[PDB]
Amino acid sequence: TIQKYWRMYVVRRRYKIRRAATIVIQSYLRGYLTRNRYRKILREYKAV
Amino acid sequence: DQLTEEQIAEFKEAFSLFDKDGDGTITTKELGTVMRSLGQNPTEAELQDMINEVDADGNGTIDFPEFLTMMARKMKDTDSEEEIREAFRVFDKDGNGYISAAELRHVMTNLGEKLTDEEVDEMIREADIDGDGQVNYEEFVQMMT
Amino acid sequence: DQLTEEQIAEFKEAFSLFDKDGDGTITTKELGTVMRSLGQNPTEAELQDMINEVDADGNGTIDFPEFLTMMARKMKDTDSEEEIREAFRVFDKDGNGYISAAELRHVMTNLGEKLTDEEVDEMIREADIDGDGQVNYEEFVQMMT
Amino acid sequence: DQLTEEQIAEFKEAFSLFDKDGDGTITTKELGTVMRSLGQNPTEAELQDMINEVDADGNGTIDFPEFLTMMARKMKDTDSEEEIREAFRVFDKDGNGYISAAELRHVMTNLGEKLTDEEVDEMIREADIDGDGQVNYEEFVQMMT
């Protein structure tokens, strides 16, 4: 009865950590892709 | 009420971590992993009961709806809220509510479904144990909840 | 907190790419694009909460001093060199910083705020994302600056 | 009507180098030439727009009042050199007031509408450029004024 609960706790915890980390990495990557499009658009516009 | 669309989405995301084709299937080995990732609370022997319907030696494969069918019955079963207190009541050192570290090694590594060495490490680091010691079970239940 | 000249200038170094006629006001939907261009890395939900902290209409317009008043209330930190490294640590191959590129593609398309197929087309063309190899996270963060 | 008698006289005098018969009409081939001469800095696509605004089949010929109407479409724009000093800042490595000759060559012939081979040759000769180095944008905008 304790062994079932501990198995639940550690797996649920490591799932939360990995889901949060995934969202952080996705958010930073969409940050980069935004910043790259901004840098391209800005250079094009100022060149003209 | 059971099965608003968003429930199925959240549960399918948890499963989609483990399928590496997108065909809707996983190995039977990860069935316990997806189930416990959502916080469902079966024993190893309770997973084994289901796996006898599908697996020749513990290395087979299983669809999302089969997993979700097991989950649908397990989601109506009790949360073990009384059951875990009855369990910890046995391993108190003196009757003031405090589990001994010595008894806890036998509970981790001898009795029942046990624990492996590199995840016994986890409980030792959770409990800050460098010698002889103890832990309050109402607080530890509150933490595992 | 209060705001200062060089920070306000840097905020306009982003904003004035989008204030195309120099109105000093933009329709509120584009604010997410502005804030991500400015180097903050929030979710859609945090962009909605930073709008909630000034009562604002996402379908309306936001004039520059009201935007600066939001920036003086800004609640979600999203620029830290350590926070992004903590996220990569759970994906390390052995403790020396290596990240499997194929596994990262799988997880980023199947868990959390998932990448769409057209965003994968864009990502291939504009981030050179390996389908066979692996990358050490220390450089990879500073590639995405 | 949007121009004073003094402004009309100035623009008529310049136009009478490109109208060659004095009947009050110019070829579309020199329309860019006269506008670039009269202080304006129009893009190739903006010349294309201003012609197809008057007639999209036409005759390759434009009346003097219609030409003054193209000048009126431009003269609303608050154009001045400080935004151009700011335009070169986007291509400075140090903040020193300097663009590299390689980055300038990329800027002139990869991005935007693009200068031709002879427009580059003609500019290099006028600018007193020597070697693939770097060029001060404060001094260059002083020359461009």
From Swiss-Prot, chain A:
Question: What tissues express this gene product?
Answer: Detected in melanocytes.
Membrane-traversing stretches: none
Q: Locate the IQ domain: which residues?
A: 1-17, 18-42
Summary of the function given for this chain in its UniProt record: Processive actin-based motor that can move in large steps approximating the 36-nm pseudo-repeat of the actin filament. Can hydrolyze ATP in the presence of actin, which is essential for its function as a motor protein. Involved in melanosome transport. Also mediates the transport of vesicles to the plasma membrane. May also be required for some polarization process involved in dendrite formation.
Q: Name the family.
A: Belongs to the TRAFAC class myosin-kinesin ATPase superfamily. Myosin family.
> What quaternary structure, including any partners, is listed in this protein's UniProt entry?
May be a homodimer, which associates with multiple calmodulin or myosin light chains. Interacts with RIPL2, the interaction is required for its role in dendrite formation. Interacts with MLPH. Interacts with SYTL4. Interacts with MYRIP. Interacts with RAB10; mediates the transport to the plasma membrane of SLC2A4/GLUT4 storage vesicles. Interacts with FMR1; this interaction occurs in association with polyribosome.
What is the designated name of this protein? Answer: Unconventional myosin-Va
Which species is listed as the source?
A: Mus musculus (Mouse)
Swiss-Prot record, chains B, C, D:
Which residue stretches belong to region Necessary and sufficient for interaction with PCP4? 75-145
Point out the cross-link Glycyl lysine isopeptide (Lys-Gly) (interchain with G-Cter in SUMO2) in this chain: K20
Q: Coiled-coil regions in this chain? A: none
Q: What GO molecular function annotation could you give as one example from this UniProt entry?
A: adenylate cyclase activator activity
Q: Where does Ca(2+) 2 bind?
A: D55, D57, N59, T61, E66
Keywords of this protein's UniProt record, alphabetized?
A: Acetylation, Calcium, Cell projection, Cilium, Cytoplasm, Cytoskeleton, Flagellum, Isopeptide bond, Metal-binding, Methylation, Phosphoprotein, Repeat, Ubl conjugation
User: Which positions does UniProt annotate for Ca(2+) 3 binding?
Assistant: D92, D94, N96, Y98, E103
Q: Which residues carry this modification: N6-acetyllysine?
A: K20, K93
Name where it's found. Cytoplasm, Cytoskeleton, Spindle; Cytoplasm, Cytoskeleton, Spindle pole; Cytoplasm, Cytoskeleton, Microtubule organizing center, Centrosome; Cell projection, Cilium, Flagellum
Domain EF-hand, by residue range, is 6-41, 42-77, 79-114, 115-145
PTM annotation (N6,N6,N6-trimethyllysine): residues: K114
Binding site residues for Ca(2+) 1: D19, D21, D23, T25, E30
Pfam families per UniProt: EF-hand_7
- Phosphoserine-modified residues are S80, S100
In the UniProt record, which is one GO cellular component term? Answer: presynaptic cytosol
Q: Where is this cross-link: Glycyl lysine isopeptide (Lys-Gly) (interchain with G-Cter in ubiquitin)?
A: K20
Chief place where the protein resides:
cytoplasm
- Which InterPro entries does this UniProt record tie to the protein? CALM/Myosin/TropC-like (IPR050230), EF-hand-dom_pair (IPR011992), EF_Hand_1_Ca_BS (IPR018247), EF_hand_dom (IPR002048)
Modification sites for N6-methyllysine: K114
Fill in the domain comment: The N-terminal and C-terminal lobes of CALM bind to the C-terminus of KCNQ1 in a clamp-like conformation. Binding of CALM C-terminus to KCNQ1 is calcium-independent but is essential for assembly of the structure. Binding of CALM N-terminus to KCNQ1 is calcium-dependent and regulates electrophysiological activity of the channel. The C-lobe interacts with KCNN4 channels in a calcium-independent manner, whereas the N-lobe interacts with the S4-S5 linker of KCNN4 in a calcium-dependent manner playing a role as calcium sensor and gating the channel.
Quaternary assembly: Homotetramer. Interacts with CEP97, CCP110, MYO1C, TTN/titin and SRY. Interacts with MYO10. Interacts with RRAD. Interacts with USP6; the interaction is calcium dependent. Interacts with CDK5RAP2. Interacts with SCN5A. Interacts with FCHO1. Interacts with MIP in a 1:2 stoichiometry; the interaction with the cytoplasmic domains from two MIP subunits promotes MIP water channel closure. Interacts with ORAI1; this may play a role in the regulation of ORAI1-mediated calcium transport. Interacts with RYR1. Interacts with MYO5A. Interacts with IQCF1. Interacts with SYT7.
- Protein's job: Calmodulin acts as part of a calcium signal transduction pathway by mediating the control of a large number of enzymes, ion channels, aquaporins and other proteins through calcium-binding. Calcium-binding is required for the activation of calmodulin. Among the enzymes to be stimulated by the calmodulin-calcium complex are a number of protein kinases, such as myosin light-chain kinases and calmodulin-dependent protein kinase type II (CaMK2), and phosphatases.
Family membership, please give it. Belongs to the calmodulin family.
What name is this protein filed under?
Answer: Calmodulin-1
